[PDB]
Design a binder for this molecule. Sequence first.
Ligand SMILES: COC(=O)c1cc2c(cc1CS(C)(=O)=O)-c1cn(C)c(=O)c3[nH]cc(c13)CN2c1ncc(F)cc1F
Length: 126
Amino acid sequence: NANPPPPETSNPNKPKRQTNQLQYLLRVVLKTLWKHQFAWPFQQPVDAVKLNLPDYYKIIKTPMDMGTIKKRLENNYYWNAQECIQDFNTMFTNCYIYNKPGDDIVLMAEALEKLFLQKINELPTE
Ligand SMILES: COC(=O)c1cc2c(cc1CS(C)(=O)=O)-c1cn(C)c(=O)c3[nH]cc(c13)CN2c1ncc(F)cc1F
């Protein structure tokens, strides 16, 4: 009934590294998706209490959102770029799982995903 705590975003027990792919994911991918007209429902964890969706966290057990991804990138939480790409994919699929196909929120997620895929097809080498 209450919201769960947000996903973990910082872990000092994991080694950290800076790569051109991780820099691209924050400076280009996250920054461009954040400013998209349909980004607003995906910038923070789904607040099931404020939105009156009592079954959201009964259905969605692996929540993910762009605010959490931004924090993970800033905190060097990811070692590999694919970990970050899987978080974006988890965010889109959570929307497709919870909501009815053809719903406006699903159309918004589909548009963000299309832009995300355009950015991932241009990921820099190594
Ligand atoms: C202040 O922003 C909002 O009011 C808000 C509305 C909103 C969602 C998220 C937010 C952000 S939050 C921090 O409150 O969780 C939202 C997000 N996601 C990912 C979902 O799967 C949803 N299913 C139904 C809603 C959402 C309600 N709804 C929504 N429903 C239909 C839409 F077309 C667009 C939407 F944003």
